[PDB]
Amino acid sequence: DSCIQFTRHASDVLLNLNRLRSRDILTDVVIVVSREQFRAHKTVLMACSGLFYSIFTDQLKCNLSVINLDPEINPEGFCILLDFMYTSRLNLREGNIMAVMATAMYLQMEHVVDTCRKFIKASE
Amino acid sequence: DSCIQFTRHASDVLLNLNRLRSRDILTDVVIVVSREQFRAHKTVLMACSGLFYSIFTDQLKCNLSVINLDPEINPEGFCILLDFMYTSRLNLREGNIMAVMATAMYLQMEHVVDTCRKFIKASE
């Protein structure tokens, strides 16, 4: 086509979606990770995770307001990944890398799994 | 912080939200523009438009499944802007620039209004 493109548009959209998340505006699901609860937008979760994409396209699960993750999932690892979904920034540290990689594999977040594998390979 | 950032994340999120829109997945509102209807995600509309942000943060309008725009709004101009919201690409043409600018002013989409004003000033 003959379209023009606004370079910062996608980043500005995500920044605003994160602002809605911070103020709990139009969040439509609670993700339960053991004793912790995380409110989010189903659409953002699907856009970032192969697991959430599969969950919310299911004709029965699409209508659930609460989703319980596998008990092996670490709430801190999930929190780090939820923040990454809404910001593009990943708080990857020596102390959390194993939990973050395990959580990203479960959530099916391929680019996160890739950087974790590379950071782990560098330290061996 | 000491975060790392994935450059393409925001663009990939928006591409996936547009894929959900194309398949009519988890759309939660119909925007009525005269005889035309446009299905969308309230969160994406709020993230792109000062008017939709104001509408869906209202305690009564947040619950509406149908929103009727002012009858002066052109359905083609709205369609072009809805596509821009989900893609960052704006189909700005000599034949549609006036309708697109009028629609972007109504929707409170400041960057679109700015490029329309500049393209109009160049042709005078």
């Binding site: 023009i4 493109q5 370079t7 | -």
Partner: peptide
């Protein structure tokens, strides 16, 4: 704005 750019030419994509």
């Amino acid at each position: 704005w750019v030419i994509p």
